[PDB]
């Protein structure tokens, strides 16, 4: 009992690739400009006398690097998964991307916890003490992101295959299955599950607490608080669900068919594009809304 599927040549999807290239360049320009302005405003504001919260500066830096290292992916993608650059460039580029992306994702959760504590606990602590605490946690999260990225970056080396070339990760022969699935799971549990759970719980508690206080409700709003979670979910869900679905396919839990392969490839690419849009939308949600920020920008 044998089967012989002769998969036909993939249709001329290059139009899809060109379309995705247009989206990436738009994100590149928008994200670079927006995040740079936030950093500039934040650093300047200190002279006036504002209390510029350190998480915002660190988060802006992380997103700036991510959106600044997109063009390499565009060059690779325009050639349909090929790679014309050197190996050292591949290692360095991936390392930068992973560190910054995980840094940004973790900083969202840290911001949520700090906000809830600020309205509840830190109210009486002196400014110096909370400033020191924020600096310490800022250092720690960078180190954790550094630790997360390293394992896969070290296991990276190109191949030649025909006459094309690729930059594909190499994993131990004796434990290929474990390493691949383990890498992609830590991408989820430490990338989507834990940050999303903490963020959702803490912002719901903030909504309850702010509702209880009579004075706070008038000036603030109860819609932006829920908007945070909704935007994060919509931007970061599709990519992870698609990748998890593909992982199940790799283990042969689903029948294989040409339509399936085409759909997964296009779906994976599209949902990754949305995951970058997250970085573009982050600054507008977290800074541009604040009235003080808008007025501070207006005076400069």
């Amino acid at each position, epitope marked *: 009992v044998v089967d012989t599927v002769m998969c036909p040549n993939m249709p001329n999807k290059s139009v899809l690739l060109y379309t995705l290239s247009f989206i990436y360049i738009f994100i590149f320009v928008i994200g670079m400009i927006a995040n740079s302005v936030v950093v500039w405003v934040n650093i300047q504001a200190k002279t006036t006398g*504002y*209390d510029t919260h350190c998480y915002i500066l660190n988060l802006a830096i992380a997103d700036l690097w991510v959106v600044l290292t997109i063009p390499v992916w565009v060059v690779s993608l325009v050639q349909h998964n090929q790679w014309p650059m050197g190996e050292l460039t591949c290692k360095v580029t991936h390392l930068i991307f992973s560190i910054n992306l995980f840094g940004s994702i973790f900083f969202l959760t840290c911001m949520s916890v700090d906000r809830y504590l*600020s*309205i509840t*606990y830190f*109210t*009486n602590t002196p400014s*110096s003490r909370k400033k020191m605490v924020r600096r310490v946690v800022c250092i720690l999260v960078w180190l954790l992101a550094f630790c997360v990225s390293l394992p896969d970056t070290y296991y990276l080396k190109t191949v030649t295959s025909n006459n094309e070339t690729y930059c594909r990760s190499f994993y131990p022969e004796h434990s290929i299955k474990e390493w691949l699935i383990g890498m992609e799971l830590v991408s989820v549990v430490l990338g989507f599950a834990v940050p999303f759970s903490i963020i959702a719980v803490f912002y719901f508690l903030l909504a309850r607490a702010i509702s209880a206080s009579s004075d706070q409700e008038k*000036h603030s709003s109860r819609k932006i608080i829920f908007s945070y979670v909704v935007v994060f979910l919509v931007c970061w869900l599709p990519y992870h669900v698609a990748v998890l679905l593909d992982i199940f396919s790799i283990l042969h839990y689903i029948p294989f068919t040409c339509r399936l392969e085409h759909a997964l490839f296009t779906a994976l690419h599209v949902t990754q594009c949305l995951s970058l849009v997250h970085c573009c939308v982050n600054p507008v949600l977290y800074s541009f809304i604040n009235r*003080n920020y808008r007025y501070e920008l207006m005076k400069a």
Partner: antibody
Amino acid sequence: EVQLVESGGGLVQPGGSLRLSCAASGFNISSSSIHWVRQAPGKGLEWVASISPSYGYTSYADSVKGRFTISADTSKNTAYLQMNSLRAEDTAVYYCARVSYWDWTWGWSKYEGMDYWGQGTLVTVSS
Amino acid sequence: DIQMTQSPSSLSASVGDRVTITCRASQSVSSAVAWYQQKPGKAPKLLIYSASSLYSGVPSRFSGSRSGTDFTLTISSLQPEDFATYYCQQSYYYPITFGQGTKVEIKR
């Protein structure tokens, strides 16, 4: 609409105890802290203590470290200050002042200060 | 425990005259200052908080400025309604240490 009114006072024999009450109305107390500032006759002000009813975190001024137990009761959005071992150097008037912490400006807030003050009460310990 | 030296202790300026009061800090404080006014035998009010931002409600004559660790309060001109005492503050190192105090009396 924020109004703070103190209560409790009057002369007390040296080496006693006092329990001052600062009832806050018109705004929930959990968000903001509460501070007590002292003013001896014909002299500059000075800080004493501060309490956040949210989780009970407190602080004190070195001059009176250990002699005061500032207490909070979020149930009736009130602040309580208990005095002990009163000496003939605390003769002054006590104002209970709030230090609000807005939330619509979280990431770009300004170092806040005391906003709403009360008339205070007069404490005159004498023998 | 940060000493907040404040000078001059006393002043005397006629109506509608500029006047400036300087408050200093021995250490460095990250622009966390206030400036309270106190009429005789009354609850002190607030004029300027943060470092140079005015507080809603008070006239616009009062304003503040920062320079290293030597803050200063500026008055555009003294109406016959602001003859009282002003206390500076720092809120970046518990305990809070108020300044000595400034008295601005009428001149004749």
